[PDB]
């Protein structure tokens, strides 16, 4: 029959979970955001659509930090994104409190994963309307991740989601081939700025604001920090230049 897509934990005859798939539609309808893993860190960047001149510039920050070494950015229903970070934060505090050492990125990823997967087990809840790109530096390296509404996640070299995910993925794949040795944090920041600008074409109708953050063993001491001032403008320019 039909109706397999009305309740959240139901398996359709072909083994799918339609509500999780409809959740994805909410994610694809969102702003584009990416992540780039560099030789000793990771960079996050996101597109911020300027609905009007009334939005105070630089104020509505979207990227979020977890603990002191993890960055998270997402596309879709913003509120769902925050909800997930809040859990991530409790998840990280709990881990540090018991084990003393700040939580490893792989461990942190599964914490987010199990939580999201949990929201696809009952019809009394709705799946998350966001895909999340997060990562940081830990005991052994840098790690980048993307988490889908199904709870599925994998480690990435580069990642993108949202409206212009295809352009982004395309640009990301180029970098992967032309740099088997590894991009530097400094470079990744610029490259990132470019990818957002490019991918912004799939939304070229509205003006936007660029936002970047990074976590580099050498550039930030392994702490997640936002790219501001000079370093920011320098990247904005590098993009504005290669956009023509």
């Amino acid at each position: 029959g039909t109706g397999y897509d009305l309740s959240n934990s139901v398996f359709s005859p072909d083994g799918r979970n339609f509500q999780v798939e409809y959740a994805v539609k909410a994610v694809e309808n969102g702003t584009t955001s990416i992540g780039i893993k560099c030789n000793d860190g990771v960079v996050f960047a996101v597109e911020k659509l300027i609905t009007s001149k009334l939005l105070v510039p630089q104020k509505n920050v979207k990227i979020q930090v977890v603990d002191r070494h993890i960055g998270c950015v997402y596309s879709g229903l913003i509120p769902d994104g925050r909800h997930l970070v809040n859990r991530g934060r409790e998840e990280a505090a709990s881990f540090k409190k018991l084990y003393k050492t700040p939580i490893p990125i792989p461990a942190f990823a599964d914490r987010l994963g199990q939580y999201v997967q949990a929201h696809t087990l009952y019809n009394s809840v709705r799946p998350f309307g966001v895909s999340t790109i997060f990562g940081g530096v830990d005991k052994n390296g840098a790690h980048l991740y993307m988490l889908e509404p199904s709870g599925s996640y994998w480690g990435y070299k580069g990642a993108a989601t949202g409206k212009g995910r295809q352009s982004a993925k395309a640009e990301l794949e180029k970098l992967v081939d032309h740099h088997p040795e590894g991009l530097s944090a400094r470079e990744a920041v610029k490259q990132a700025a470019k990818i957002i600008y490019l991918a912004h074409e799939d939304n070229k109708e509205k003006d936007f604001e660029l936002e970047i953050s990074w976590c580099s063993l050498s550039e930030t001491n392994g702490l997640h920090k936002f790219v501001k001032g000079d370093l920011l403008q320098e990247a904005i320019d590098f993009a504005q230049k290669e956009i023509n």
């Binding site: 897509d5 009305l6 959240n8 509500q19 409809y22 959740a23 994805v24 539609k25 909410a26 994610v27 694809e28 309808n29 009007s52 001149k53 009334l54 939005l55 105070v56 104020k59 509505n60 229903l77 913003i78 509120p79 769902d80 925050r82 909800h83 809040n86 929201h119 019809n123 009394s124 809840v125 709705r126 799946p127 309307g129």
Partner: protein, 233 residues
């Protein structure tokens, strides 16, 4: 279509929409208009109070949350009482425990998160009201727009409710002008009334009909109604 995916907030439509949330947003549009704008020294709230009969009062639309914070509502009044009450507690908590006044940006995050919980679980319903929060904290004057979806944004000015679009375009135009009305509340308030009258149509703002509130540098969030707003009509 829609009819099969709008029976409760826990259901996504085939296109990724949340109708219950959207239907809630509709309650705001049906609400009376209210405006908000700020310079670098003050923040103002101008709200059009709506009356039932000519024998009835004009329902209050501005609520003070603390000495440095407050908001204006558009939609289900009861839901604003709940949300403002929660904002009052959060401000109170910050003071009592950390002897710190709650950052307007932090209040926004708290409202977003409280609204979000009511859009992901079975049984509840989204809040059916919009809020404009203004306040003066350690980083100056601030204005926030809260939508039941859980989306909160910081702006220089804005308006919500019926015909709100009028005032909103006016402000988006007058921007460079009012954003510099520093050290002169009366000028900011007048600019607020001029933006709000851009959404009139039915009548004209009267004395027991207009409601204004201001906060800033050396001005604790205070509300003016009636005679007190006469000098602005």
């Amino acid at each position: 279509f829609r009819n099969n995916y709008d029976g409760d907030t826990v259901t996504f439509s085939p296109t990724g929409r949340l109708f219950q949330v959207e239907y809630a947003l509709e309650a705001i549009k049906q609400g009376s208009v209210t405006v908000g704008l700020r310079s670098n020294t003050h923040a103002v709230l101008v709200a059009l109070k709506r009356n039932a009969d000519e024998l009835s009062s004009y329902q209050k639309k501005i609520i003070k949350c603390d000495e440095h914070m407050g908001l204006s509502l558009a939609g289900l009044a009861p839901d604003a009482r709940v949300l403002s009450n929660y904002l009052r507690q959060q401000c109170n908590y910050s003071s009592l425990v950390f002897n710190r006044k709650l950052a307007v940006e932090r209040a926004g995050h708290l409202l977003c998160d409280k609204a979000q919980k009511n859009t992901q679980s079975y049984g509840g319903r989204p809040y059916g009201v919009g809020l404009l929060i203004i306040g003066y904290d350690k980083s100056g004057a601030h204005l926030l727009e809260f939508q039941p979806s859980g989306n909160v944004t910081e702006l220089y000015g804005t308006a919500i409710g019926a015909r709100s679009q009028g005032a909103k375009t006016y402000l988006e135009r007058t921007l460079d002008t009012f954003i510099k009305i520093d050290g002169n509340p009366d000028e900011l308030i007048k600019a607020g009334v001029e933006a709000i009258s851009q959404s009139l149509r039915d009548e004209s703002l009267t004395v027991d009909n207009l409601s204004i509130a201001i906060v800033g540098k050396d001005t604790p969030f205070t509300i003016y109604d009636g005679e007190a707003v006469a000098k602005y009509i």
